[PDB]
Amino acid sequence: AYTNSFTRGVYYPDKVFRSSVLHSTQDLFLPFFSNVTWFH
Amino acid sequence: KYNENGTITDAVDCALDPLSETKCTLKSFTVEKGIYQTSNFRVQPTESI
Amino acid sequence: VRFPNITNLCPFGEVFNDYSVLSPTKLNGPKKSTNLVKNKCVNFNFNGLTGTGVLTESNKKFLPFQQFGRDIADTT
Numbered sequence A: 001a002y003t004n005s006f007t008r009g010v011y012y013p014d015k016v017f018r019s020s021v022l023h024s025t026q027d028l029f030l031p032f033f034s035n036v037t038w039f040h
Numbered sequence B: 001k002y003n004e005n006g007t008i009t010d011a012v013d014c015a016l017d018p019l020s021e022t023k024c025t026l027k028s029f030t031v032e033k034g035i036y037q038t039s040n041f042r043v044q045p046t047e048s049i
Numbered sequence C: 001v002r003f004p005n006i007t008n009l010c011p012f013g014e015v016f017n018d019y020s021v022l023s024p025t026k027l028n029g030p031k032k033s034t035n036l037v038k039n040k041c042v043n044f045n046f047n048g049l050t051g052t053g054v055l056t057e058s059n060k061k062f063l064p065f066q067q068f069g070r071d072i073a074d075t076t
């Protein structure tokens, strides 16, 4: 079985305070609308 | 996107659809009407000789 | 110079009874810590971050996993 996330798996890449700052980064993430495997 | 306290409010994948690439080159979540050169493209080889 | 407390003391009381109890001169491993002072141009060292500025009481509020802050141009 399968489903998807629609927006999931976003974590803080570093210990840096920023306030109202758009910030691009390149790291290991989970893509939007991506299939994950159901389990029981 | 960070708020005024340091919490991630929103996020954008820069590879999903070309509207997100347009957002990812302009560093914003709203885009004004126009045309925007984003990236390149290149036909990939199929086998090796 | 600012570093956290010395907490992970290795058990040197379990095979004998910080190498100060005895190149042997540069084996240290605790890290020293002086006290801070405000409103004067000093050379600060916060946990490996080095600079030269005027340290002042703040108004911002962090999140309890964060160490320092930056800005638009990514300056501390």
Ligand SMILES: *[C@@H]1O[C@H](CO)[C@@H](O)[C@H](O)[C@H]1NC(C)=O
Pocket (backbone or CB within 6 Å): B003, B004, B005
């Ligand atoms: C930001 O911090 C303030 C504390 O003054 C809090 O009241 C507020 O709910 C926080 N979140 C926002 C503005 O999204």
